[PDB]
Subunit: 129 residues, 3 copies
């Protein structure tokens, strides 16, 4: 379970998971691993979420939150997406080739276009704007 | 009473109603009807609210929230304005010629300039920014 | 203690105070006095806060909140910074040459670039965006 600042508050909603995702590659071992997800605005998988592709500007524009409470595509096709929270930067990795418990420079570098603000070692975000 | 997502939270404040508005045309029958209101920034009616005119860019720029808890100009010249909430899109109609309980395409189409974000069938908004 | 709208909520965090500031000039007499602070993004004093300089665009861009609960550099080198609140405009003065309990025209005039919104006599702000 990824830590987050209780004082800041959390807003989360369930979303259907994109079936075409190799969701199993988006765990870490015993340790928590947060990642960003984007929503498909239109098309056949509209309203389904998938791991944000930082190299695709439309994926970046449609980020909807972070997966902070794990996932289990085989047990449930819905995933809890946190749209607003403050999350320590060490827990967010956007890729399989990204060490756990280490801030991801790809995310930190893309924070402006991701609408992330880093304050006191946390990403602050609210994808309801 | 217009439904809204309790989990998201609500922030609301009373505002004086613009006296020059035919407020009676801004009910629906037995059913709830949310609409956007804008504030007059200056002038003699400064700080008074009126139904947003989607065809007037200055009205759009000065939206201050939605009327979600009804109004009664004859019983009280103040109206409770919700500045931040998440409201199902079916309940918001911006005009007399707009069927109740049907999403209003004029609002949906203007959501970007209105600073509305549609997520899971709700308008999310916060006019304190 | 500066008043603020309880209904709106408050989010605050402690920050180290910039040691090079004449912090004693940032009290008012018996009366409360709120002011904006900015964070140093980088450099030797990174993550330390100092009173925003409205005439420096980089200071304006790095505002992080308001000091609403007083300060005491000699008793504690940390100051509680309110990143999100709604504060009556009479209490915020950004300078020694600014009368207490009087809205500061320098702040009001710079509200757009400060990301302050004035609603019903309060500054609304959220520097987590």
């Amino acid at each position: 379970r990824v830590p987050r600042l209780h004082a800041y508050g959390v807003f989360a909603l369930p979303f259907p998971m994109d079936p075409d995702v190799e969701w199993g590659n988006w765990f870490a071992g015993p340790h928590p691993k947060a990642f960003l997800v984007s929503v498909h605005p239109s098309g056949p998988k509209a309203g389904h979420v998938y791991p944000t592709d930082l190299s695709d500007p439309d994926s970046v524009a449609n980020v909807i939150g972070m997966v902070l409470d794990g996932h289990d595509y085989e047990a449930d096709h819905n995933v809890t997406v946190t749209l607003r929270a403050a999350v320590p930067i060490e827990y967010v990795q956007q890729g399989i080739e990204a060490p756990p418990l280490q801030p991801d420079p790809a995310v930190l570098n893309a924070a402006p276009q991701l609408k992330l603000k880093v304050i006191k070692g946390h990403y602050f975000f609210d994808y309801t704007r």
